[PDB]
Write a protein that binds this ligand. Structure first.
Ligand SMILES: COC1(CS(=O)(=O)N2C[C@@H](C(=O)Nc3cncc4ccccc34)c3cc(Cl)ccc3C2=O)CC1
Ligand SMILES: COC1(CS(=O)(=O)N2C[C@@H](C(=O)Nc3cncc4ccccc34)c3cc(Cl)ccc3C2=O)CC1
Ligand SMILES: [Cl-]
Lengths: 305, 305
């Protein structure tokens, strides 16, 4: 029993964190095999940030202009290249702590663990989700650039996010490990704003199933709904549309609890209308959307209470 | 910006997790130097658990009855002894991954990171607090016994909790690393209940300071109060008493935000008597009490390990 916002154990990722310095700028890098990956804005001065010409700035750099530090050991840079918004520094030593890994680009609604780092040193681990507006609600300060997001399903680490910037609303933007930004963002200090955010409906449904598995049913009702009537209602509460894909994905949780997806959809509709009336669901007074169907299956028991 | 329930990086602890098997029972162990620490109930069958005489059960065991597995390597048990509710298995190999460590007994209200393990393999990391009723609200399934709680102080891991059991309410009970239970619990299959819980007042105040640092000030008011007046209010809402020690500990957060601790108490008093009125604080509709004053400072300043 219990249901917590659970992050993956960070040890496999901690062994890859390094500190990258280019002139006056210092940030974090990810050292896998003989390559160190970091945000390309490490080559920028504060006077460059508005409209940087990265190719022009990079062509003026040599290998020895990049200082890479792993613990208290200096790594020797023997090559450098740019792939989209990520800089790849070839080093003379393969990381002995390199775990089995993959680079994956995730979709909105997907969750991951973030290992927040400063000066190549991990300071904390937390779980978060890729918001529908392609931002993440992280906890990041100046110097956290280069911190990564990952999932560790089985023994392989799937890297899905590298931190690049904070937007004026306090939310964060970054790229996949191939340097492609999530969302309509750019690595420039120009005016950029996150689009209107929405609640991840399939994730709220998954979390309602997690509550049934753990013994709670106060929110269920005798009603059902069509998929379209649910979306007509939920979108009036800024909820993302629920697709047939989402309904199919919730199939196993539906079979485990005995509650059809569209019946859980009717329960959600009622919750949005009534609020909780002083009650909580899994220790929360809000509807939680940062647990996917896959997270619920991984954390909860296979036997309903 | 941002504020997350953040756990310490788990890597130093992951390198210590092993699987302990005694007959039919399998659980987790903590391997530090040449000793493996695990719950002493590993020697119990389902019949023994009803009324166990642990010394009598232990005297029957030999070193070879205990199977200890570190990754895919079998460790050789060369001795065994009991300290309170923890079993100590002496092994022929010192753990090469043993970090700098201490065993500390924490007090209610203090927080720690939990590395949830199954079969000696870490599956997740989450942050939680020692509740005033000495239980923890964890996320644990069968096989999680032996999972540990810890904090990191500079480069030293302070082990403070080892998981033993789940109570009927779904909350958890365990011991320090010297086998002393937190709370009025015993290690046996018998009816036990968590006492009435209370809210950790100094922690709610710390979290209100965190919200102010993050630009959430709607709950601030022009009022102040006294320790006597506020403690009457706290007693009424099942809040733990606030002492002069708590006020002193909140001193730095008070100086950083410009809000005197009893100024923040008058905000908390108004929140208790009147609610949030449809508003949230740091994305929560409840008053959060699982962040200590030190956690707020550490996360708002980026301390690394
Ligand atoms: C909105 O103003 C901020 C960010 S900034 O310092 O002005 N800044 C510097 C930098 C940036 O965001 N860095 C940071 C990353 N993560 C969390 C940060 C929390 C505080 C300070 C900086 C942080 C950046 C990088 C790129 Cl690729 C593009 C733009 C910027 C940029 O705008 C103060 C929040
Ligand atoms: C309250 O009923 C439960 C627990 S139990 O299975 O009946 N049980 C087994 C065991 C125990 O708690 N184990 C578990 C620990 N953590 C999470 C667990 C989730 C499910 C099952 C077991 C879990 C235990 C150990 C000690 Cl030292 C003393 C007593 C017990 C005990 O009572 C069904 C939840
Ligand atoms: Cl995805």
């Amino acid at each position: 029993s219990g249901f917590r916002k659970m992050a993956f154990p960070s040890g496999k990722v901690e062994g890859c964190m390094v500190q990258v310095t280019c002139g006056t700028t210092t940030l974090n890098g990810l050292w896998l095999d003989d390559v160190v990956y970091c945000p390309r804005h490490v080559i920028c001065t504060s006077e460059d940030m508005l409209n940087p010409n990265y190719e022009d700035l990079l062509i003026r750099k040599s290998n020895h202009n990049f200082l890479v530090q792993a613990g208290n050991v200096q790594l020797r840079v023997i090559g450098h290249s740019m792939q989209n918004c990520v800089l790849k520094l070839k080093v003379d030593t393969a990381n002995p702590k390199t775990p089995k890994y993959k680079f994956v680009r995730i979709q909105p609604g997907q969750t991951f663990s973030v290992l927040a780092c400063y000066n190549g040193s991990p300071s904390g681990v937390y779980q978060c989700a890729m918001r529908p507006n392609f931002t993440i609600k992280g906890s990041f300060l100046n110097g956290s650039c280069g911190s990564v997001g990952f999932n560790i399903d089985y023994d392989c680490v799937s890297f899905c996010y590298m931190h690049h910037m904070e937007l004026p609303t306090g939310v964060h933007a970054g790229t996949d490990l191939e340097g492609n930004f999530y969302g309509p963002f750019v690595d420039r200090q120009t005016a950029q704003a996150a689009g209107t955010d929405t609640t991840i409906t399939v994730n709220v449904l998954a979390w309602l199933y997690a509550a049934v598995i753990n013994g709670d049913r106060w929110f269920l009702n005798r009603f059902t709904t069509t998929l379209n009537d649910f979306n007509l209602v939920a979108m009036k509460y800024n909820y993302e549309p629920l697709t047939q894909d989402h309904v199919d994905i919730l199939g196993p949780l539906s079979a485990q609890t005995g509650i059809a997806v569209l019946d859980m959809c009717a329960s959600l509709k009622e919750l949005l209308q009534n609020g909780m009336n002083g009650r909580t669901i899994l220790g929360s007074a809000l509807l939680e959307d940062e647990f996917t169907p896959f997270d619920v299956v991984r954390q909860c028991s296979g036997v309903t209470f």
